[PDB]
C-alpha cells in the first residue's frame, strides 16, 4: 500500500577513537538498505539490501560527496549549538535528525518529514504544511525565525520532489519482491504451569513482515489489556519479526482464553487457543 523512504542521521562532537563523527542509516519501510559514516574525516558506505547491487557507480560517488558535506556541516552546527547554550567544550554532544518521504498506493507523494534533536531532546520539527516549524525553547525559537524568514523549507520541498521520490520509486521497483510483500504471522500458544498452580499462556507470533502487529488476549468477550505481559516487537535477524503476549490464568480454565493476532498480511485477525 503506502511506502516510506527514511534516513536516520547522527552527528557526535567528541567521539571515542574508532567511533564515527557522523553516521546515517537508510530504510525503505522496515528494510535497511545502506549505512554511511565518517570516521576521522574518512567517509564510508555499505549496502545492506540486495537491490542496492543494482545501483550504478555514480550513485555511490554522489553519496560519498553528500556524506563529506553533511559531516562537515553537522560538526559546524554542533560548534554553534554549544555556544548558544553556553555549554562547555570537552564534553560530547549529539545532533540527530530524521528525513523521509512517503507515497500512497498510486506511488504519488503523500507527505514528508524533517525533524532534529539536540542531546536526545526535540529541537525543531518541520510541520505537515512543509513551510512552518515547531520549536521548543528560546534557542530553537531563534532557529525557527531564521528558517522561516529565509524560506529554507522550500529547499527541502525540492529535495523531496526530486531525489527522495526518485530513490523511493527506484528502490520499490528494483526490490519489489522484498518490499511489496506481506508475510503473515505463524502463531501458536505455549503452556507453562507455575508452582502456584496457575498457568502462563504465552501467545507467540513469528516470521511476519512488516513489523507492525497487535497481539491481544480476551476472556470470553472482555479484553485483558491490563492483565497482559508483552515484549516489544523484535527482529529475528532474517528480515522477519517476532513478538509474544502472555496472561496468567487458573488451571483448568485455559480454554476460556483466546489470543487475537492482527497483521496486514491477514484479511481478518487470527484467533487461537491453547491446543
Amino acid at each position: 500500500g503506502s511506502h516510506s523512504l527514511r534516513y536516520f542521521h547522527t552527528a557526535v562532537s567528541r567521539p571515542g577513537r574508532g567511533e564515527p563523527q557522523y553516521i546515517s542509516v537508510g530504510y525503505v519501510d522496515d528494510v535497511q538498505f545502506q549505512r554511511c559514516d565518517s570516521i576521522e574525516e574518512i567517509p564510508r558506505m555499505e549496502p545492506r539490501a540486495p537491490w542496492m547491487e543494482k545501483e550504478r557507480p555514480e550513485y555511490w560517488k554522489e553519496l560519498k560527496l553528500k556524506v563529506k558535506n553533511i559531516a562537515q556541516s553537522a560538526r559546524a552546527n554542533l560548534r554553534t549549538l554549544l555556544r548558544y547554550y553556553n555549554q562547555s567544550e570537552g564534553g560530547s554532544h549529539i545532533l540527530q535528525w530524521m528525513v523521509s518521504c512517503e507515497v500512497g498506493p498510486d506511488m504519488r507523494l503523500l507527505g514528508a518529514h524533517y525533524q532534529a534533536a539536540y542531546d536526545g531532546s526535540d529541537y525543531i520539527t518541520l510541520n505537515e504544511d512543509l513551510s512552518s516549524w515547531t520549536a521548543v525553547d528560546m534557542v530553537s525559537q531563534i532557529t525557527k525565525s531564521r528558517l522561516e524568514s529565509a524560506g529554507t523549507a522550500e529547499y527541502f520541498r525540492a529535495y523531496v520532489e526530486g531525489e527522495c521520490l526518485e530513490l523511493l520509486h527506484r528502490f520499490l521497483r528494483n526490490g519489489k519482491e522484498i518490499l511489496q510483500r506481506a508475510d503473515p504471522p505463524k502463531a501458536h500458544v505455549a503452556h507453562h504451569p507455575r508452582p502456584k498452580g496457575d498457568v502462563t499462556l504465552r501467545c507467540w507470533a513469528l516470521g511476519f513482515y512488516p513489523a507492525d502487529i497487535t497481539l491481544t488476549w480476551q476472556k470470553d468477550e472482555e479484553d485483558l489489556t491490563q492483565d497482559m505481559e508483552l515484549v516489544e516487537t523484535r527482529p529475528s535477524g532474517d528480515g522477519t519479526f517476532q513478538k509474544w503476549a502472555a496472561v496468567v490464568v487458573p488451571s483448568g480454565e485455559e480454554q476460556r482464553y483466546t489470543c487475537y493476532v492482527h497483521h496486514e498480511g491477514l484479511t481478518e485477525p487470527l484467533a487461537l487457543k491453547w491446543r
Binding site: 553533511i70 556541516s73 554553534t80 549549538l81 532534529a116 528558517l147 529535495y159 531525489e163
Partner: peptide, 7 residues
Amino acid sequence: MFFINVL
C-alpha cells in the same frame, strides 16, 4: 541525504 543548518 539532506541537512539544514539550524544556527
